[PDB]
């Protein structure tokens, strides 16, 4: 239901440069490094076919151009097919793609035809954004607050629990908070009894989901969420270190995961 617009993807190369610097500042690693920690993998110029898809709301302005940019940035031999849909898929396989990258309104996937691995953008994004959050060099705690427990949030929290962090979760939807607590063992967080975190992961499609009362100074807020989870004011007031970028960090996570 929450979908990228062309405006979100303006100057994707700067957005990506900027997010990569923030990731380096927070964790000591660039995005490649994070991906190598998660998956053990690295790029070797694998050939990536990017197929536009016209189903649902259709082709999104700047979407495949941005994927072309992203993939090039990380050292893949990528290209965008002239035809969309099934015809484009055929064009890609025939033009030697080893990994297919394509999306409809519900699923963005990467499929590596050589080894059979396939990634879904939603867990891949939650996993990398959570990993990045957790690796905050100067956090001084293994307490992590996770706001948003849907298709992106839940796998991030799960990753974090598997990584032996002490995870506190909140979702405005009590059903999703309940499922996360009874399937993962996270501690349910209460906005009425807040404590401060130096590590925060947000995966929501809503503004101002991070209360002032949970922010410590210099804390990290890692969020795939659109629009921004915290106001500029609160972000300046606590010099929060923001990692937020619309497509490329999740895309890298999908790609490095199928290698
Ligand atoms: N930057 C990227 O690369 C990237 C990749 C994937 C998704 N996204 C974005 O991530 C966001 C989340 O995606 P999703 O698929 O998990 O959505 P989802 O609907 O599956 O989950 C969103 C969750 O946030 C909860 N929520 C809404 N307002 C809240 C509030 N104030 N407090 C706590 N919880 C609240 C909802 O109850 C819901 O459970 C969307 O904005 C989507 O566009 C970004
Ligand atoms: N950046 C958020 C995560 C990636 C998926 C994103 N939610 C999204 O907008 N998905 C829809 C993508 C549709 C792509 C369209 N069929 C196209 O090929 O241009
Ligand atoms: Mg991203
Ligand atoms: Na948000």
From Swiss-Prot:
Top-level class of the enzyme under EC nomenclature:
oxidoreductase
The alphabetical list of record keywords is: Amino-acid biosynthesis, NAD, Oxidoreductase
- Enzymatic reactions: (3R)-3-methyl-D-ornithyl-N(6)-L-lysine + NAD(+) = L-pyrrolysine + NH4(+) + NADH + 2 H(+)
E.C. number: 1.4.1.-
Q: Which residues bind NAD(+)?
A: 151-152, 171, 206, 224, 226, 245
Segments crossing the lipid bilayer: none
Q: Enumerate the residues binding L-pyrrolysine.
A: 4, 53, 60, 103
Pathway(s) it belongs to = Amino-acid biosynthesis; L-pyrrolysine biosynthesis
- What Pfam family is a match for this entry? PylD_N
- What does the sequence similarity comment in the record state about its family? Belongs to the PylD family.
Main role? Catalyzes the ultimate step of the pyrrolysine biosynthesis pathway by converting the isopeptide (3R)-3-methyl-D-ornithyl-N(6)-L-lysine to the 22nd proteinogenic amino acid. Is able to use surrogate substrates such as (3R)-D-ornithyl-N(6)-L-lysine in vitro.
Q: What is this protein called?
A: Pyrrolysine synthase
Query: What gene is it encoded by?
Result: pylD
């Amino acid at each position: 239901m929450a979908l990228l617009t062309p405006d979100d993807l303006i100057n994707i190369n700067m957005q990506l440069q900027k997010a990569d610097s923030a990731v380096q500042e927070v964790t000591g690693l660039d995005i490649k490094g994070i991906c190598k920690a998660l998956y053990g993998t690295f790029s070797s110029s694998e050939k990536v076919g990017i197929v536009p898809v016209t189903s649902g709301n259709g082709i999104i302005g700047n979407f495949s151009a941005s994927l072309h940019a992203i993939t090039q940035y990380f050292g893949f031999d990528s290209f965008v097919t002239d035809m969309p849909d099934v015809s484009g898929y055929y064009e890609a396989v025939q033009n030697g793609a080893e990994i297919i990258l394509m999306a409809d309104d519900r699923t963005f996937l990467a499929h590596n035809l050589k080894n059979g691995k396939m990634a879904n953008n939603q867990p891949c994004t939650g996993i990398i954004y959570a990993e990045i959050a957790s690796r905050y060099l100067k956090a001084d705690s293994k307490d992590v607050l996770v706001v948003g427990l849907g298709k992106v949030g839940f796998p991030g929290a799960e990753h974090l629990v598997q990584k032996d962090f002490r995870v506190y979760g909140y979702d405005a939807d009590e059903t999703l908070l309940e499922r996360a607590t009874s399937n993962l063992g996270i501690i349910p967080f209460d906005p009425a009894n807040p404590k401060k975190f130096s590590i925060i992961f947000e995966a929501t499609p809503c503004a101002n989901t991070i209360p002032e009362a949970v922010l410590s100074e210099n804390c990290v807020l890692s969020t795939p969420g659109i629009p921004c989870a915290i106001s500029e004011e609160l972000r300046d007031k606590y010099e929060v270190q923001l990692i937020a970028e619309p497509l490329g960090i999740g895309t890298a996570s999908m790609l490095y995961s199928v290698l």
